[PDB]
Amino acid sequence: GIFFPALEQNMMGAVLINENDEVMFFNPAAEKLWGYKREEVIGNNIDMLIPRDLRPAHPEYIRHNREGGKARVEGMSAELQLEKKDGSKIWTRFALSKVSAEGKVYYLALVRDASVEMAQKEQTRQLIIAVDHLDRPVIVLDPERHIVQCNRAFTEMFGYCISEASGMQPDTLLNTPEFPADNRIRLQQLLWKTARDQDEFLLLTRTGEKIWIKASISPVYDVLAHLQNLVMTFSDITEERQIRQLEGNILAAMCSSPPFHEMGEIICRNIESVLNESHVSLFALRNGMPIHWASSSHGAEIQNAQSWSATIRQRDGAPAGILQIKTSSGAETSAFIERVADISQHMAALALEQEKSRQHIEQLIQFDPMTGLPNRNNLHNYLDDLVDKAVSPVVYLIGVDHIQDVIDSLGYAWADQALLEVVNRFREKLKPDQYLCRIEGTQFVLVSLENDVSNITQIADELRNVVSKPIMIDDKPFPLTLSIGISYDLGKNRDYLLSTAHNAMDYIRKNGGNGWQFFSPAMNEMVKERLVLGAALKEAISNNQLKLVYQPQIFAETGELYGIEALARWHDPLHGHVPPSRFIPLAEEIGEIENIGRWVIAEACRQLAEWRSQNIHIPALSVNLSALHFRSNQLPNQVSDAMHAWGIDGHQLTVEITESMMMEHDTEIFKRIQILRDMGVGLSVDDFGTGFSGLSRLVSLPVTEIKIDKSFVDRCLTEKRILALLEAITSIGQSLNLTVVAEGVETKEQFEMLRKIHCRVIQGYFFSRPLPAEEIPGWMSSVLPLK
């Protein structure tokens, strides 16, 4: 047989044993494997080749195998420790063969030196230990981008093992959630990058949780500079992204320069959002003492909690503050607490140097570096100057509320721009004698010098409705609102005024939303009374409870009634008699002048209808109209309706407009005046505030009557210089066909002094007090003529 020399020249070792456990063959490699010799071993027992641990208990195994008769020798199949002659224990791999030759059971063993293979196995055991020890998910991929090796951290975080996660792309079994736009494409693209790269993904666990991971792919090239493998390292970056969101939010705050305490609050809120059910406290070092900058309002008690304190230092190393975080022990990892506290320490450190720089310069600066408005110090100086000069100012604290919506929808920058738009609206509606300043954030001060409650109410209404129009920000409306606190005393102090106005403003802010309120509710009950009176006036106008009273006008010489003026009256069961000189400005403020005009015109035409049905001539009726009633582009329609519904065509009706209308210069108003005058209804102008150039323009824009006011007729007695007004106006009267109507006559001397200038018509108490309609005909039929 040629196998004997084949085994002699072979690399393996052949040790064939006969029935009596005697070695019948010994190849040269057996000398290297055992340190023996063929002369020493051949013919002798196998006891020399067995490890000393179990030398005598091995013929028992051999004998047990001998009687079985099985073909294959399934035993002796694992790498086993073999001890040499010198005592060294190498690792060998065996391969047995039962040879039943000539009725005798032989045993052949193809021993191979498993030293190198088991050194590889020891190396891979150590590498498995080192790769499962670090808790760092690492996978390895072929050029086809399929997983070939994974680790224990990867299994822990994704729930897949080497058996399941092998041969498939790391996206087929780790598909991203429903959102398909970017995650799937980025995950598929990272796997096919030929250079070192990395990305961040949402991957799905076997159970189904959403975990943000950071995957880093790097190629490993062979000797021939060819792609051999691609290793992917996954980092669980849930906490990393939490701290990154913290960094982003603190950056967006600090770069936008927020207030000190609000910055502390947002820092604390981010820390709590990263560390659930914890307590956070933050202190600055002022004069070496702790000053409480901010802390979370969630002061829940925690048992066996750990408190980590970090000394917030300055740039040069000097201490600046203390940042203390108390949290449940074991709920959040200590190293994560360290990293969060360190990053927040740097953030709050820069915030603290900024605040320290601002601290010794805020008392010296005079302007707000944001909106360009004067600051609290400038306001204090201005108020001190006012009180020293003995002037009583009125302070409006304006709180621009509902700013948090733009804060959390757009950002601090866009919210500050909303503030700028609001203050620019304030500037465009501002007045020369008003002082505007910013005290703290959304809080402004308007210092005015208006004493009247009506003026204060009008200013408050204009301030509250300037923000009624939505604020346009990035093509997104924002309905901001104002809480106004009004403080005013005869004089107490700037501190007192500010404190009272702040009390009012915080009351309004906490008890609802937009609105304005006085301090000292004795000045708010007045507003309530005026509002209820206005509501009563509106409902009386609606329900037709108003009344008109008529005052005859007389000719100078003939003693004949030129006309009667319809003066409004009101009588409420609760308020008694409300004078026109009290409810006409109220109607102007509310917006009831239009309704009053329609009502007076309709009632006047109706009463003309009855006084024509019965035998009364009623030559002319003068109806009072205001500025808004004429500026509205509707008047001639209802005036013509009033004439043609009762046959009272305009040669009888007359309108007296305010001198403010003549002072105003509006082409549309002038055209409407001309159209009305064309219809035959007369026109009268009272008072002489408008100049004689205005009166000549009024000659151009035709009228019929000019009224001399009671304020001038009263001084006609004493001031003899104003007789020229009456004389000249009368002269214009007979020059260009105007009727002059003296008002406010009360005494015989006052009438007879105007008698010489030959005034056309006279109206006042000297001839008839305003008489009710039910006895106007009695006066007509009894008194006229008067002479």
Ligand X SMILES: Nc1nc2c(ncn2[C@@H]2O[C@@H]3COP(=O)(O)O[C@H]4[C@@H](O)[C@H](n5cnc6c(=O)[nH]c(N)nc65)O[C@@H]4COP(=O)(O)O[C@H]3[C@H]2O)c(=O)[nH]1
Question: In the range 552-611, which residues lie near ligand X by CB under 6 A?
Answer: 566-568, 579-581, 584, 596, 600
* Residue closest to 463 by CA, chosen among 439, 434, 440, 489: 434
Nearest-CB residue to ligand HEM?
75
Scan residues 49-88 and list those touching ligand HEM (CB under 6 A).
Answer: 49-51, 54, 58, 61-62, 64-65, 73-76, 80-82
* Residue closest to 413 by CA, chosen among 239, 254, 191: 254
Contact between 296 and 269 (Cβ < 8 Å): yes
What are the angstrom distances between the C-alpha of 154 and each of 140, 215, 237, 661? 12, 12, 13, 86
Kindly determine how many residues on this chain lie close enough to bind ligand HEM according to the rule CB under 6 A.
21
Judged by beta carbon, residue 187 or residue 620, the one nearer ligand X is 620
Scan residues 751-770 and list those touching ligand X (CB under 6 A).
Answer: 763-765, 770
Non-local CB neighbours of 320 within 8 Å, separated by 6+ positions: 284, 285, 312, 313, 314, 349, 352, 353, 356
* Six-digit token string for 193: 């990058």
Kindly determine how many residues on this chain lie close enough to bind ligand X according to the rule CB under 6 A.
22
Select from its own copies, ligand X, ligand HEM, none the partner in contact with residue 61, using the beta carbon and a kind-dependent cut-off of 5 to 8 Å.
ligand HEM
Tell me how far, at minimum, the Cβ of 624 lies from ligand X, in Å.
Answer: 4
Tell me how far, at minimum, the Cβ of 533 lies from ligand X, in Å.
Answer: 16
List beta partners, residue 217.
Answer: 197, 232
Q: Name residue 763's amino acid.
A: Q
β-sheet with 138-141: strand ranges across: 147-149, 138-141, 227-236, 210-221, 197-204
Judged by beta carbon, residue 34 or residue 201, the one nearer ligand HEM is 34
Q: How far, rounded to the nearest angstrom, does the alpha carbon of residue 500 sit from its chain's CA centroid?
A: 28
* Residue closest to 599 by CA, chosen among 627, 570, 619: 570
Measured between alpha carbons, how far is 331 from 30 in angstroms, rounded to an integer?
A: 62
Tell me how far, at minimum, the Cβ of 92 lies from ligand HEM, in Å.
Answer: 6
Judged by beta carbon, residue 599 or residue 670, the one nearer ligand X is 599
| Other CB atoms within 10 Å distance of the CB of residue 445 | 23
Helices (H) then strands (E): counts for the chain: 27, 32
Select from ligand HEM, Mg ion, ligand X, none the partner in contact with residue 581, using the beta carbon and a kind-dependent cut-off of 5 to 8 Å.
ligand X
Site string for ligand X, 716-755 (x = CB under 6 A): ---------------------------xxxx---------
Under the binding rule (CB under 5 A), the answer on residue 624 touching Mg ion is yes
Measured between alpha carbons, how far is 695 from 704 in angstroms, rounded to an integer?
A: 12
Tell me how far, at minimum, the Cβ of 199 lies from ligand HEM, in Å.
Answer: 42
Select from ligand HEM, its own copies, ligand X, none the partner in contact with residue 496, using the beta carbon and a kind-dependent cut-off of 5 to 8 Å.
none
Select from ligand HEM, its own copies, ligand X, none the partner in contact with residue 411, using the beta carbon and a kind-dependent cut-off of 5 to 8 Å.
its own copies
Does a cis peptide bond (omega within 30 degrees of 0) precede residue 785? yes
Judged by beta carbon, residue 153 or residue 280, the one nearer its own copies is 153
Tell me how far, at minimum, the Cβ of 214 lies from ligand HEM, in Å.
Answer: 43
Tell me how far, at minimum, the Cβ of 7 lies from its own copies, in Å.
Answer: 7
Judged by beta carbon, residue 445 or residue 541, the one nearer its own copies is 445
* Residue closest to 220 by CA, chosen among 236, 196, 254: 196
Select from its own copies, ligand HEM, Mg ion, none the partner in contact with residue 709, using the beta carbon and a kind-dependent cut-off of 5 to 8 Å.
Mg ion
- Alpha helices (H) along 449-592: 453-466, 494-510, 525-543, 580-590
76 is in an annotated binding site: yes
Judged by beta carbon, residue 337 or residue 568, the one nearer Mg ion is 568
Select from ligand X, Mg ion, ligand HEM, none the partner in contact with residue 64, using the beta carbon and a kind-dependent cut-off of 5 to 8 Å.
ligand HEM
Under the binding rule (CB under 6 A), the answer on residue 771 touching ligand X is no
Select from ligand X, its own copies, Mg ion, none the partner in contact with residue 355, using the beta carbon and a kind-dependent cut-off of 5 to 8 Å.
none
Tell me how far, at minimum, the Cβ of 744 lies from Mg ion, in Å.
Answer: 7
Tell me how far, at minimum, the Cβ of 57 lies from its own copies, in Å.
Answer: 21
Tokens 């750990």 map to which residue? 306
* Six-digit token string for 407: 């804060």
Pairing of strands 515-518, 481-487: parallel
758 is in an annotated binding site: no
Judged by beta carbon, residue 70 or residue 510, the one nearer ligand HEM is 70
Judged by beta carbon, residue 64 or residue 427, the one nearer ligand HEM is 64
Site string for ligand HEM, 17-36 (x = CB under 6 A): x-------------------
Tell me how far, at minimum, the Cβ of 226 lies from ligand HEM, in Å.
Answer: 21
Residues 709, 715, 717, 721, CA torsion sign: negative
What are the angstrom distances between the C-alpha of 606 and each of 108, 239, 379, 600, 651? 140, 84, 60, 10, 16
Residues 504, 505, 511, 515, CA torsion sign: positive
Judged by beta carbon, residue 139 or residue 600, the one nearer Mg ion is 600
Tell me how far, at minimum, the Cβ of 549 lies from Mg ion, in Å.
Answer: 13
Choose the binding region for Mg ion from 135-143, 349-357, 538-546, 655-663 (rule: CB under 5 A).
Answer: 655-663
SS3 for 298-363 is: CCCCCCCEEEEEEEEECCCCCEEEEEEEEEEECCECHHHHHHHHHHHHHHHHHHHHHHHHHHHHHC
Judged by beta carbon, residue 41 or residue 741, the one nearer ligand HEM is 41
Site string for ligand X, 617-646 (x = CB under 6 A): -------xxx--------------------
Judged by beta carbon, residue 79 or residue 421, the one nearer ligand HEM is 79
551: helix, strand or coil: strand
Non-local CB neighbours of 747 within 8 Å, separated by 6+ positions: 766
For residue 473, what is the enclosing H or E element? strand 471-473
First CA to last CA across the chain, in angstroms?
173
Q: Name residue 461's amino acid.
A: D
Residue ranges of the binding site for heme: 58, 76
Instruction: Point out which residues bind ligand X (CB under 6 A).
Output: 551, 566-568, 579-581, 584, 596, 600, 624-626, 710, 743-746, 763-765, 770
Interacting residue ranges for ligand HEM, rule: CB under 6 A: 15, 17, 49-51, 54, 58, 61-62, 64-65, 73-76, 80-82, 96, 107, 109
**Residues contributing to the site for Mg ion (CB under 5 A):** 624, 656, 686, 709, 743
Known binding-site positions: 58, 76
